[PDB]
């Protein structure tokens, strides 16, 4: 069974880059950058982090992919080999559609 944790965060998007910020358990925060094409905008989201190994998620995440599906947001986390480390399911205040991803990592705050 994967462990479940409350998370919350924000996405801010320019036209060609975006930043994702997620507050997780154990006083850790995820910052990720994605580039490509988006509609400029921003919003908050709240949800659940699912992972079978939180320590490994925080140590080994170097990448994220996301799927924005209206007021649903899915964020998947990966290590440098493309291995899946866990994911977030969240509700987003601001409806957005798109898929993308990029570099990111977890750190203390």
Author numbering: 86 to 194
The authors write:
Virulence-associated proteins (Vaps) contribute to the virulence of the pathogen Rhodococcus equi, but their mode of action has remained elusive. At the top of the barrel, four loops connect the eight β-strands. The same applies to virulence-associated protein B (VapB), which is also encoded on a virulence plasmid; this plasmid is mostly absent from foal isolates and is predominantly found in porcine R. equi isolates.
Here, we determined the structure of the protease-resistant VapB core in a new crystal form with two molecules in the asymmetric unit. The crystals diffracted to 1.71 Å resolution and the structure was solved by molecular replacement. The same three residues (Asn152, Asn159 and Asn161) from both chains contribute to nitrate binding. In one of them, the loop regions at the top of the barrel adopt a different conformation from other Vap structures. An all-against-all analysis of the available Vap structures using the DALI server revealed that with regard to these loops, chain A of our new VapB structure is most distant from the other Vap structures. Okoko and coworkers suggested that Vap proteins may have functions that only manifest upon the conformational changes that frequently accompany the binding of small molecules to proteins. Our new VapB structure reveals that despite the crossover connections, VapB can form a large cavity between the β3–β4 loop and the β7–β8 loop. The bottom of the large VapB cavity is formed by hydrophobic residues (Val96, Phe105, Phe130, Ala153, Leu158 and Ala177), while its side and mouth contain both hydrophobic (for example Ile124 and Val181) and polar (for example Ser98, Gln103, Thr123, Tyr151 and Ser179) residues. The large cavity in VapB contains 12 ordered water molecules (A311, A314, A320, A322, A332, A344, A357, A360, A380, A390, A401 and A403), giving a hint on the size and shape of a putative ligand.
